[PDB]
């Protein structure tokens, strides 16, 4: 093979996923955190490990880069520590959030070519990559991560900006809500250390009820839904209706004091903002992606809720790939490996010729 390996980097609000194009899974996954004393800068797992003596910064907020100096440190960490490669020796495919500001796209481009000297690079919308990973070029993606959720209508490979909706309700909000209701139960989960424990409980024992009220009634009249969780010190606690009450906030944000529509309504509203001619394709291809869509039972619940909102004659189909926690990254691996995509990379030559703004023409 004459070609060097291409890198695929998916930066998220809570976790970054990095690897090599062609692989079926990322080689490294670490927290999107940079810390400095309360080496001078700590990044990823080590930063989390030593958070006690550091002041942490989160470069990506709600999917958007807001601290470029620390974002640069996360990328440096990715190349040299996690993947152990030299960026000037490999093309790099980066991911971005839906509706990412123009100026941000140009900044990412300039940094890759001028700071890391990448031989080539490209930036793709996260939701679009997840759609590709499911074998589709048309459909609507509900991407819910740790800091933000988006409903992104995509037609023939192109996202529709006017119909994209953003919901600032995701994994982090759900973790804190579980800490709250478990505390109301009689336990006490309030510290940063305890937040990590509860995040684990959430990922291991939570689920989406098909019928909220019936589930609440079953939990109130029996112990059939209770599950046990063992703490490090050995204490075993019980989780009951909290198991499904936590993710229920996705469908009813008022539980969190938010007036926003739930994920089902948001999905429906995005579809209605699209041209009537493509709505049926979207209803028949609603794909879930992101860690927060991993809850058991979420696909069937979405099927039920959307069916209730859409015309009775509409064919509804919810797709929930088993590997959807990393579908964004996998889609990127697939894209960067495609024969027809090789001509799409922005080369150092092209960057030198057109500058940062070339990203708007090359990465549409």
Of the candidate residues 147, 153, 253, 331, the single one contacting ligand ATP (CB under 6 A): 147
- The entry of ligand ATP, Ca ion, none that residue 254 binds, CB within 5 to 8 Å by partner kind: Ca ion
Near ligand ATP in 184-243, by CB under 6 A: 199, 202-203
CB of 223 to ligand ATP, least distance (A): 23
CB of 103 to ligand ATP, least distance (A): 19
Query: Contact between 290 and ligand ATP (CB under 6 A)?
Result: yes
Geometric angle at alpha carbon 101, from 96 and 103, rounded to 5°: 105
Residue 324, exposed/middle/buried by CB under 10 A (0-12, 13-18, 19+)? buried
Whether the Cβ atoms of residue 281 and residue 138 lie closer than 8 Å to each other: yes
198 within 8 A of 178, measured Cβ to Cβ: yes
Separation between Cα atoms, residue 362 and residue 100, nearest integer Å: 15
What does residue 79 show for φ and ψ, rounded to 5 degrees?
Answer: -65, -55
- Nearer CB in complex with Ca ion: 148/163: 148
How many residues touch ligand ATP under the rule CB under 6 A: the total is: 21
How far lies 278's CA from each of 42, 154, 155, 275, 318, in Å? Answer: 47, 10, 8, 6, 16
| Residues 319-358: x where in contact with ligand ATP by CB under 6 A, - otherwise, as a string | ------x---------------------------------
Interaction with ligand ATP in 60-89: which residues (CB under 6 A)?
63
Nearer Cβ to Ca ion (145/331): 145
Could you tell me the smallest distance in angstroms from the CB atom of residue 267 to ligand ATP? 16
Considering the complex, what minimum distance in angstroms separates the CB of residue 11 from ligand ATP?
8
User: CB 108 → Ca ion: shortest distance, Å?
Assistant: 15
Of the pair 117, 254, the CB lying nearest Ca ion is at: 254
Question: Residue 307, exposed/middle/buried by CB under 10 A (0-12, 13-18, 19+)?
Answer: middle
Burial 144-177 (b: 16+ CB within 10 A, else e): bbbbbbbbbbbbeeebbeebbbbbebbbbbbbbb
Task: State the residues that interact with Ca ion by CB under 5 A.
Answer: 12, 145, 254
Residue 10 CB, shortest distance to ligand ATP, in Å, is 7
Q: Which of 324, 364, 335, 296 is nearest to 141 (CA)?
A: 324
CB 155, CB 278: distance < 8 Å: yes
Burial class (CB in 10 A: 0-12, 13-18, 19+), 109: buried
In the complex, the smallest distance separating the C-beta of residue 249 from ligand ATP, rounded to whole angstroms, is 12
Q: Which 8-state DSSP code applies to residue 237?
A: E
Near ligand ATP by CB under 6 A, which window of 187-195, 273-281, 290-298, 342-350?
Answer: 290-298
- Residue from 118, 292, 319, 363 binding ligand ATP (CB under 6 A): 292
The site partner of 262 among ligand ATP, Ca ion, none (C-beta below 5 to 8 Å per kind) is none
Nearer to Ca ion, 19 or 145 (CB): 145
Q: Does 19 bind ligand ATP (CB under 6 A)?
A: no
Radius of gyration of the chain (CA): 21
Q: What, of Ca ion, ligand ATP, none, does residue 251 touch, CB below 5 to 8 Å by kind? A: none
d(CA 11, CA 237): 35
Q: How far is the CB of 94 from Ca ion (least distance, A)?
A: 12
> What 3-state class would DSSP assign to 73?
helix
Alpha-carbon dihedral sign for residues 98, 99, 104, 106? positive
Is residue 171 part of the contact set for ligand ATP (CB under 6 A)?
yes
Q: Which residues precede gaps in the chain, with C-N > 2.5 A?
A: 38
The residue within the footprint of ligand ATP, chosen from 98, 153, 291, 332 (CB under 6 A), is 291
Contact of residue 147 among Ca ion, ligand ATP, none (CB under 5-8 Å per partner type): ligand ATP
Q: Which is nearer to ligand ATP, 51 or 280 (CB)?
A: 51
Contacts with ligand ATP by CB under 6 A lie at 12-15, 63, 145-148, 170-172, 199, 202-203, 290-292, 294-295, 325
């Amino acid at each position: 093979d004459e070609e060097v390996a291409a890198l695929v980097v998916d930066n998220g609000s809570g976790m970054c996923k990095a690897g090599f194009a062609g692989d079926d899974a990322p080689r490294a996954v670490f927290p999107s955190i940079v810390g400095r004393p309360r080496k001078d800068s700590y990044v990823g797992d080590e930063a989390q490990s030593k958070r006690g003596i550091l002041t942490l910064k989160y470069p990506i907020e709600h999917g958007i880069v807001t601290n470029w100096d620390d974002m640069e440190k996360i990328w440096h960490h990715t190349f040299y520590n996690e993947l152990r490669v030299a960026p000037e020796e490999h093309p790099v495919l980066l991911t971005e959030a839906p509706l990412n500001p123009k100026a941000n796209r140009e900044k990412m481009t300039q940094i890759m070519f001028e700071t890391f000297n990448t031989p080539a690079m490209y930036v793709a919308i996260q939701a679009v990559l997840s759609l590709y990973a499911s074998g589709r070029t048309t459909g609507i993606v509900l991407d819910s991560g740790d800091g933000v959720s988006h409903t992104v209508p995509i037609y023939e490979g192109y996202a529709l900006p006017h119909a994209i909706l953003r919901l600032d309700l995701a994994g982090r909000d759900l973790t804190d809500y579980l800490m709250k209701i478990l505390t109301e139960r009689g336990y006490s989960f309030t510290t940063t250390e305890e937040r990590e424990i509860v995040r684990d409980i959430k990922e291991k024992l939570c689920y989406v009820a098909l019928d909220f009220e019936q589930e609440m009634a079953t939990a109130a009249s029996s112990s059939s839904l209770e599950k046990s969780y063992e703490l490090k010190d050995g204490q075993v606690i019980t989780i009951g209706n909290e198991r499904f009450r936590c993710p229920e906030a996705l469908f009813q944000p008022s539980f969190l004091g938010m007036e926003a529509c739930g994920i089902h309504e948001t999905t429906y509203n995005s579809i209605m903002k699209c041209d009537v001619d493509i709505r049926k394709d979207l209803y028949a291809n609603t794909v879930l992606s992101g860690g927060t869509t991993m809850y058991p039972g979420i696909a069937d619940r979405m099927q039920k809720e959307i069916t209730a909102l859409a015309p009775s004659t509409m064919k509804i189909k919810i797709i929930a790939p088993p590997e959807r926690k990393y579908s964004v990254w996998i889609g990127g691996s697939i894209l960067a490996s495609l024969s027809t995509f090789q001509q799409m990379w922005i080369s150092k030559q092209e960057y030198d010729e057109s500058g940062p703004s070339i990203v708007h023409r090359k990465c549409f």
